[PDB]
Amino acid sequence: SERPFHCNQCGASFTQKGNLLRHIKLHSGEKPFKCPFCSYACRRRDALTGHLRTHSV
Amino acid sequence: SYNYVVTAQKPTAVNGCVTGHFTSAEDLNLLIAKNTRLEIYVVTAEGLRPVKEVGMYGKIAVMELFRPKGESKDLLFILTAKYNACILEYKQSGESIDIITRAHGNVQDRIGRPSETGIIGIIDPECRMIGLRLYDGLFKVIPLKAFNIRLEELHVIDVKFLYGCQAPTICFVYQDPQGRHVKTYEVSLREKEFNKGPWKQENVEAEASMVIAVPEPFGGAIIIGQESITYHNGDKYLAIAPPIIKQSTIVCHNRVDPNGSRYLLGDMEGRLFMLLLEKTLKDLRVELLGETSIAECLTYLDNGVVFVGSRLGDSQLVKLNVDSNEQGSYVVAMETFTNLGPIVDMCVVDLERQGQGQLVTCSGAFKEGSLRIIRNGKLHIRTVPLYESPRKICYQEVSQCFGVLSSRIEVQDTSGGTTALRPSASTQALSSSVSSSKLFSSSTAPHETSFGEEVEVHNLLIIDQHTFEVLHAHQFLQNEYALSLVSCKLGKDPNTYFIVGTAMVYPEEAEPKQGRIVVFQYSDGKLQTVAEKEVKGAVYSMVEFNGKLLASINSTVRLYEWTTEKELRTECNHYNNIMALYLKTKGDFILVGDLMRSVLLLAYKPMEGNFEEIARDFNPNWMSAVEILDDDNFLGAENAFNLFVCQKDSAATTDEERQHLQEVGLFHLGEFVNVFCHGSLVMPTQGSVLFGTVNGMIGLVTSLSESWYNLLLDMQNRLNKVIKSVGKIEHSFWRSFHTERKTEPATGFIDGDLIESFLDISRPKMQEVVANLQYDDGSGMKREATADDLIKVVEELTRIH
Amino acid sequence: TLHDDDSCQVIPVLPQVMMILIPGQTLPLQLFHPQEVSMVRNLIQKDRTFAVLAYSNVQEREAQFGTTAEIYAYREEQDFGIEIVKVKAIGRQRFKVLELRTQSDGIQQAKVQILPECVLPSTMSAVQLESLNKCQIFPSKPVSREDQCSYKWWQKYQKRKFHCANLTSWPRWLYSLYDAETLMDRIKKQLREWDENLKDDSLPSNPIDFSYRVAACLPIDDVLRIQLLKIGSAIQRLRCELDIMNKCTSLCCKQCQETEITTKNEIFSLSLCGPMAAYVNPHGYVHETLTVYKACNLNLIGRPSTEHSWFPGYAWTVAQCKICASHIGWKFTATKKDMSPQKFWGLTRSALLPTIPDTEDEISPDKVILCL
Numbered sequence A: 001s002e003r004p005f006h007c008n009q010c011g012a013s014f015t016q017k018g019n020l021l022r023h024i025k026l027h028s029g030e031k032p033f034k035c036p037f038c039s040y041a042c043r044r045r046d047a048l049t050g051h052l053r054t055h056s057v
Numbered sequence B: 001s002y003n004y005v006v007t008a009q010k011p012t013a014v015n016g017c018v019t020g021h022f023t024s025a026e027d028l029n030l031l032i033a034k035n036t037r038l039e040i041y042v043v044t045a046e047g048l049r050p051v052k053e054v055g056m057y058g059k060i061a062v063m064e065l066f067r068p069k070g071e072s073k074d075l076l077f078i079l080t081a082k083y084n085a086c087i088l089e090y091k092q093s094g095e096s097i098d099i100i101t102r103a104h105g106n107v108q109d110r111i112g113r114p115s116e117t118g119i120i121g122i123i124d125p126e127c128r129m130i131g132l133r134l135y136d137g138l139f140k141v142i143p144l145k146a147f148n149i150r151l152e153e154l155h156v157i158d159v160k161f162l163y164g165c166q167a168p169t170i171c172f173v174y175q176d177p178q179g180r181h182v183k184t185y186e187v188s189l190r191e192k193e194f195n196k197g198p199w200k201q202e203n204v205e206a207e208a209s210m211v212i213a214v215p216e217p218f219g220g221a222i223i224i225g226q227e228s229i230t231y232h233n234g235d236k237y238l239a240i241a242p243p244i245i246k247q248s249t250i251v252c253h254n255r256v257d258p259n260g261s262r263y264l265l266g267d268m269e270g271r272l273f274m275l276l277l278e279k280t281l282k283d284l285r286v287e288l289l290g291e292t293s294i295a296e297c298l299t300y301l302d303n304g305v306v307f308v309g310s311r312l313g314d315s316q317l318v319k320l321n322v323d324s325n326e327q328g329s330y331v332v333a334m335e336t337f338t339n340l341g342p343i344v345d346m347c348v349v350d351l352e353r354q355g356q357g358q359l360v361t362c363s364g365a366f367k368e369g370s371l372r373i374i375r376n377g378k379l380h381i382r383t384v385p386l387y388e389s390p391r392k393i394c395y396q397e398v399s400q401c402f403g404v405l406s407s408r409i410e411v412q413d414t415s416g417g418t419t420a421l422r423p424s425a426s427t428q429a430l431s432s433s434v435s436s437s438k439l440f441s442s443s444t445a446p447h448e449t450s451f452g453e454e455v456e457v458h459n460l461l462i463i464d465q466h467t468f469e470v471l472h473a474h475q476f477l478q479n480e481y482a483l484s485l486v487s488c489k490l491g492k493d494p495n496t497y498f499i500v501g502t503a504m505v506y507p508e509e510a511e512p513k514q515g516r517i518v519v520f521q522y523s524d525g526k527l528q529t530v531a532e533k534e535v536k537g538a539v540y541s542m543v544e545f546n547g548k549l550l551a552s553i554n555s556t557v558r559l560y561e562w563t564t565e566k567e568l569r570t571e572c573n574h575y576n577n578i579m580a581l582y583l584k585t586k587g588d589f590i591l592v593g594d595l596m597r598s599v600l601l602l603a604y605k606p607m608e609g610n611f612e613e614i615a616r617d618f619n620p621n622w623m624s625a626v627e628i629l630d631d632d633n634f635l636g637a638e639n640a641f642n643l644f645v646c647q648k649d650s651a652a653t654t655d656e657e658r659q660h661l662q663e664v665g666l667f668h669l670g671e672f673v674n675v676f677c678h679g680s681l682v683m684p685t686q687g688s689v690l691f692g693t694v695n696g697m698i699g700l701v702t703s704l705s706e707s708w709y710n711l712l713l714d715m716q717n718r719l720n721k722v723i724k725s726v727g728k729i730e731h732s733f734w735r736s737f738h739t740e741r742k743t744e745p746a747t748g749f750i751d752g753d754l755i756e757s758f759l760d761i762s763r764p765k766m767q768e769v770v771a772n773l774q775y776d777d778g779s780g781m782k783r784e785a786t787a788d789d790l791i792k793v794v795e796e797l798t799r800i801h
Numbered sequence C: 001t002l003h004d005d006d007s008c009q010v011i012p013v014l015p016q017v018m019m020i021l022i023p024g025q026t027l028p029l030q031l032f033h034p035q036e037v038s039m040v041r042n043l044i045q046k047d048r049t050f051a052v053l054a055y056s057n058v059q060e061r062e063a064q065f066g067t068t069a070e071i072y073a074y075r076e077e078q079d080f081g082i083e084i085v086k087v088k089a090i091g092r093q094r095f096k097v098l099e100l101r102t103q104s105d106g107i108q109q110a111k112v113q114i115l116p117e118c119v120l121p122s123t124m125s126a127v128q129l130e131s132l133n134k135c136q137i138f139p140s141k142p143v144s145r146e147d148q149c150s151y152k153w154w155q156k157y158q159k160r161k162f163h164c165a166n167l168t169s170w171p172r173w174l175y176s177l178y179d180a181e182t183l184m185d186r187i188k189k190q191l192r193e194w195d196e197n198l199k200d201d202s203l204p205s206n207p208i209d210f211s212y213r214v215a216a217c218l219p220i221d222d223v224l225r226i227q228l229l230k231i232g233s234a235i236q237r238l239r240c241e242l243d244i245m246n247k248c249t250s251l252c253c254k255q256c257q258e259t260e261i262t263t264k265n266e267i268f269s270l271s272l273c274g275p276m277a278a279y280v281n282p283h284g285y286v287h288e289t290l291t292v293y294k295a296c297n298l299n300l301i302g303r304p305s306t307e308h309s310w311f312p313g314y315a316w317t318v319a320q321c322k323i324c325a326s327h328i329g330w331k332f333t334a335t336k337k338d339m340s341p342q343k344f345w346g347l348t349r350s351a352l353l354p355t356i357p358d359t360e361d362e363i364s365p366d367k368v369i370l371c372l
């Protein structure tokens, strides 16, 4: 609970390593509407929804 | 591009005037400065004897006469705007009259910051040396090699040579970060350095603007500002504050008597005053003489006659009567000289329906505002005074009348309203009207109006094309500035309408948030308001575009259609990254440009009802007017009294760069162009574009073939060797494209003035020039040039203006 | 030392220097590679000039122009055992990409043509009457806060200097939109809303350097900064900056572009440094950080920390976009009660754009986006 996992860009303190890696990846970008299943990123948030619905089925 | 430019009408604006003994020590001469033209007149009892008019390869900036040590007569000093200097001596050789260049040279330095108060050229009374102030902190001295001296005072207002000193001494007025003060400086040629001035006054009025050194009996210098007129001669100090001067700043002067007892003063508005010395000197006294045209330069002639040099209106010859007239003035105008400048707009009309074409300009400013009717058959001039400021013009044949945007000055009274300064055409209208608009009456805001200063009110005048009488005047709204004007028919409606673009200007709001386009129809002596269309910006320009109206709103270009309901339907639009100020069209193409030479070329695609960006070119420089030559070439004017033509990029092996425009035409005209328009004044060359200037100069530009251009190029180079050049200034140097720091040789433009001068050289000179030139009459036969072939070609080329 | 105009020059290229430099702007740089030193360790003898680039799509490495930089500071050690090397660089002449040589190791050289600085005189030099050249100069300026707060003084100014503009087809107040002194005043009226530092001495009179000082204080895009460098005319540069300061006010997330973060009204200058300044972190990451009073639509990450805080007395907490979770900056919270703003926010520019407010008024929807 002392958060010794700091991000070099923003400074965010995290309590476990693997949580920090999830953070530094969002710093980069590349249309940051990443679908967790397939990894297809989308340029907008509404096109992700239409893309997300093809993913459940 | 291959083009030809020629002067059709010499400049009429008067930028300088001096008197002296130039043709002989006993003869009395009058010298007139007209931009590139210099005139010599002789003072007669009845008036002035015209003698000689010449053209210079330089823009005349300084002109002063002097009498050199052991010389026959007065000699003349001239400095051009391109910093070429020349000294002239009047020469008569029997029947031949010649102006010889006794000495010449250029005084330019590569590095130097031109002073705010411009070029100043002065000569000491002994005629030992010439003083020049071109750049701040430096002072060139010519006793034509010259040397500079350092100046710690970096903001000189005015400086003159002192009378009666041990060595040539200068006294100047400067502004330092602690006020405005006067100072002195002595000159030592043997040292090529400064010596201490005889006196100094640590303070002077905050608006000191004029410095005049009084001759040797008095000595010292006269200092003039808005409120105080002071005299200083070491420890002698006088000061007066007459009331008659606070209305307008003193600007131009002249010495009346060689003993130095009387001076002339003119204001910015045409009032002419006399300075009288009540002589040691006891006191100073000022007297109003009358009202004249706004004077650029003044000269006391003789017999109580004074010459009025005017940039804004006609020059005048006036008498100075000992008694005032019934209106209170001591001055009466004896004779006026036609002045075409300034030219803010013009149009071409074949009034007699003879296929001729007459030139009608909106010229002058303030009470000198006027329309000028130009008739060829050489050029005939008719003057119609308007007594207010003309702006724009267009011709409507069906009504046989002109539309003119006009503006008059009024001052805030104390009665709530405003009062005009003088009677004008807008107050002498047979019929009058003021539009009323709830749409712009909806503007409710604070508007603290001071009550005792100037303001501009704009008006639209309708005037018959025969009598030039004020038929109708329509006054525009408060804070509304009249900008654009066009006359044409729209859509299926066969009625002809006047369309006016306006804008609302408020003193604390820079970008205009508001404007109007108002369509008018003139019927049975009355202007009927047709429609009202509010836009959120200034309506800069409007152009007829094939049955439709193309309009510019700030940086927006909008095309309007004519509804069956007699209204405007917004069809399409094109947004530009620059302010769409200049607007010219031909066919379906659209050229757009800003004030800073940013060019933008569009083409309307009828199949999709919108515009496509064809090309673009930005080159930061002040642009004054632009015009289309043809589909592929366009002509513009850009500061530096300069002209330019840019090409549509023929066959660029670069798809993304076929939208880029090169630079195939550059030319130094020597005049500031305000408006271009297609037309010719008469019944091997292609195209025709007339243009008017601030100095009233008028030229014609037409296109040439590559062969025609190539032929004239070698002829010009040949003629530059044989033509006697004023001050020995090279035509290549004169017409060189010139900014305040750059210089590049001109190309693509033939100086038609220099071409036409071929006919006035002696016949031996002609044969000498034509020799050893390969000739092509067109298509067939390349041979040696014939002395005759050029001449008869040259004449058929002269038959354009 | 500065290279003559249009000169064909060959300049090194510094990798990982990812930004767009505007002439005169100072740049502190954290070095770590020996090659970065290997370039500087020789460059410092003695040129001290490289070439900051202007990448448009750096992932594809799309750059077309840039700004020469002059390394003006360089001195560093290995204190507490860590070999630390930081330099202060400053930009000079703008340039245009021609050829480029990625040498053995990195060593990207830059075959380049210098970009000329285009100076233009006033609008009146042509038409101004030789009789009134004495009347050009005014009885100076009052340098005050009362007849500048009032416009009556400036109206007479606009009236006089363009009195002879009545000889053109265009009236005076148009040239007011091209008067450098007027445009400077229009900016001399907007940043007192933002900063309390004295404009008078701090700003340069010359518009050339004054245009670049405005350009290094506006939180704008990487791409906006680019075509801002294509502008040779300082006048055009001012109008472009101006119309930006008129339209481009409220700032959104550069990545998602669906979340209005803050408005230009919320900007404020904490210190004399300015509202925006370049700050460094302990790992060599440089942040052009803007200071704003209030921001919204952000989530905080982790607990606040005073570690390496750029504003002593405040604890920063990471802030990221509510929608896309991209980094927007930090929330700075005061440690003590006698701290002035207490909660001054603070955003990094590279994720911001003071975008055109697409006004959601059903009567004022879209409008016109003339980026001049």
Ligand SMILES: O=C1CC[C@H](N2Cc3cc(C4CCN(Cc5ccccc5)CC4)ccc3C2=O)C(=O)N1
Residues within 6 Å of the ligand: A006, A007, A008, A009, A010, A011, C280, C281, C282, C283, C285, C307, C308, C309, C310, C311, C316, C330
């Ligand atoms: O206000 C601001 C905004 C944030 C910005 N920071 C701060 C910052 C610190 C760290 C790490 C460096 C490594 N240590 C290890 C350590 C742990 C405990 C004690 C000492 C050292 C943790 C912080 C990484 C990135 C950033 C970053 O981007 C900045 O400098 N100032």
Ligand SMILES: [Zn+2]
Residues within 6 Å of the ligand: A007, A008, A009, A010, A011, A012, A023, A024, A027, C327
């Ligand atoms: Zn992070």
Ligand SMILES: [Zn+2]
Residues within 6 Å of the ligand: A035, A036, A037, A038, A039, A040, A051, A052, A055
């Ligand atoms: Zn997906």
Ligand SMILES: [Zn+2]
Residues within 6 Å of the ligand: C253, C254, C255, C256, C257, C258, C259, C321, C322, C323, C324, C325, C326
């Ligand atoms: Zn986002």
